[PDB]
Amino acid sequence: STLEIAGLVRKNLVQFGVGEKNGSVRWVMNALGVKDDWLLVPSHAYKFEKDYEMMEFYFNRGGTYYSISAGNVVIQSLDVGFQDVVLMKVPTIPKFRDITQHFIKKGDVPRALNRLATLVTTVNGTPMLISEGPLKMEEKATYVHKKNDGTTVDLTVDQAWRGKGEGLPGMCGGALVSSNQSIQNAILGIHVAGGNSILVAKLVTQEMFQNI
């Protein structure tokens, strides 16, 4: 069911924060553990700020904190080009339950279209289930990221789900879960943007995990 997939997502969601060495942590959004010490996280969380690699990355797993130098996480792309969401290996994180087999297969994508879905996410660790209207797939999606200083950058990704719904700041990194029980309520991707009552999630397929 949607709710049981949501429970598996919930258990693998951590809060992602960034800070200067010896400074306060800025808690930015969610990251989703997928297997071993690998997580999915929107790279817009960190990559547009100056000297990201000299920062400390923080992972909050239910009030137990894990930190690491940004230079010591291994970042791997989901596919060619910029997809925002990346795979991130974090050697200091406790191993995750492997939830990769619960992600949609590329070939099954059409089966989630035109059906409801649920965004399984948090706002700074408080779990929320957000209804999303019948899904469409945008071959390219563009959204605006506001940086810390106030300036903005336009981001464009390939293959992003679009659904009607109401999101809030901090919900990025949550997982979109199909209402379709015939594909076992597959995880469809990762929430990256929202506005004007529409929610956008980057498609993540099982096949993408082959990038290790």
């Binding site: 959004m29 929107p42 817009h44 999606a141 563009t142 959204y143 605006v144 990221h145 506001k146 981001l155 999101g167 809030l168 700041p169 901090g170 919900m171 990025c172 929430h191 990256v192 943007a193 929202g194 506005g195 004007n196 529409i198 956008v200």
Partner: peptide, 4 residues
């Protein structure tokens, strides 16, 4: 849309 804004990055969320």
């Amino acid at each position: 849309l804004a990055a969320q």
